[PDB]
Homo-oligomer: A and B are copies of this chain.
Amino acid sequence: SIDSAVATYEGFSIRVHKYADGDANVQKMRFDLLPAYVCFNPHMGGQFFGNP
């Protein structure tokens, strides 16, 4: 029971929540996102620099 919506920005979805504090009479919002990472094979990447 909290008002919410979903936004999109370059194929990334971000959930926005809107709620308020009663006694203090203050409104606030928040944006969240939850990522996850993998590394399949370390032998397929690295760093390259100009050789002498």
Contact = CB atoms under 8 A, between A and B. Distances in A.
Interface of A: 1-3, 17-23, 28, 30
Interface class of chain A by DSSP: strand
15 contacts: A1-B1, A1-B2, A1-B3, A1-B18, A1-B19, A1-B20, A2-B20, A2-B22, A17-B22, A19-B22, A21-B22, A21-B23, A22-B28, A22-B30, A23-B28
Nearest to A22: B19
A14 to B, nearest CB: 15
A50 B19 CA distance: 58
Nearest to A23: B21
Contacts of A21: 22-23
